[PDB]
Amino acid sequence: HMESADLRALAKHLYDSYIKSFPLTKAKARAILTGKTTDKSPFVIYDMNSLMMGEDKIKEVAIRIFQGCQFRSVEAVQEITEYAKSIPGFVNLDLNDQVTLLKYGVHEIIYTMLASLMNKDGVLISEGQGFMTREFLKSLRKPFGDFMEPKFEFAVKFNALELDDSDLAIFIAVIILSGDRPGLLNVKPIEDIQDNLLQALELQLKLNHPESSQLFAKLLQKMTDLRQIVTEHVQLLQVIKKTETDMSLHPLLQEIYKDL
């Protein structure tokens, strides 16, 4: 049990690092999506021709879009790794466990943070300069169309929680410091860190969302929807791999899936 002032200190530290680590925050994404402004309005990609035009403004189309997603995913792994290093105690853990926590945590975090860029109608891309519609992604051929849509399905549900970045900074940290990842050597020091982060998340959610009953429990229950979609995702990639030779994953993603 930490002292209340120490838990507030931890929350601010983590929000501050989250802001330094991730260039496109939820607050910026929501300002772009909600609009009103003339200076931050995205170009909208909703069909083939607008895609071609989008490349002038900002191999097969579905493959090109798929490769756009892994390029950003790789970048996200880099951003998530930098953030993890800022979590108090993380760089002090056994070095193999650091790799293990990142290996199994980044995908859950990418999905979580992907939701910040989504509404029910599409997703922000190219650092907010673009917006690709959900219907266009869903209409891609072969396996790729159905590969796009489950992310939207989770995001619509996660976004009903109305978390802001200061909440998400702690949530993300909790996910990374999971003592139940396969193959961890020293679970106790990981769980001790998570206990503090969980205490910090609990107090953060009560102060920032006082009228939102049991949001702490409901957010932890979302770590369940995350676990399942990551497993679905992996089994979709494998199917794509056994079909498509016109693609190859970045060595960073390359290694992460090796263990699944």
Ligand X SMILES: O=C(O)c1ccc(-c2nn(C(=O)c3c(Cl)cccc3C(F)(F)F)c3ccc(Cl)cc23)c(OCc2ncccn2)c1
Binding residues for rosiglitazone: 70-73, 107, 233, 257
x/- letters, 185..214, toward ligand X (CB under 6 A): ------------------------------
The site that binds its own copies (CB under 8 A) totals a number of residues, namely: 20
Beta bridge partners of 131: 44, 124
Q: How far is the CB of 236 from ligand X (least distance, A)?
A: 8
Cα of first residue to Cα of last residue in the chain, in angstroms, is: 34
Binding of ligand X by 51 (CB under 6 A)? no
| Total of chain residues touching ligand X, rule CB under 6 A | 22
Q: Least CB distance from residue 220 to its own copies, whole Å?
A: 4
Task: Residue 147: name the closest of 60, 251, 233 by CA.
Answer: 233
Q: Give dist(CA 248, CA 54) in Å, integer.
A: 25
Per residue, what are the HEC states of 16-44? Answer: HHHHHHCCCCHHHHHHHHHCCCCCCCCEE
* Residue 2 beta carbon to ligand X: minimum distance, rounded to whole angstroms: 31
State both tokens at 3. Answer: 């002292």
> What b-and-e string marks burial along 222-239, b requiring 16 or more CB atoms within 10 Å of the CB?
beeebeebbeebeeebee
What string marks each residue from 189 to 218 as x (binds its own copies by CB under 8 A) or -? -----xx--xx--x----------xx-xx-
Residues lying near its own copies in the complex (CB under 8 A) are found at 1, 157, 180, 194-195, 198-199, 202, 213-214, 216-217, 220-221, 223-225, 227-228, 231
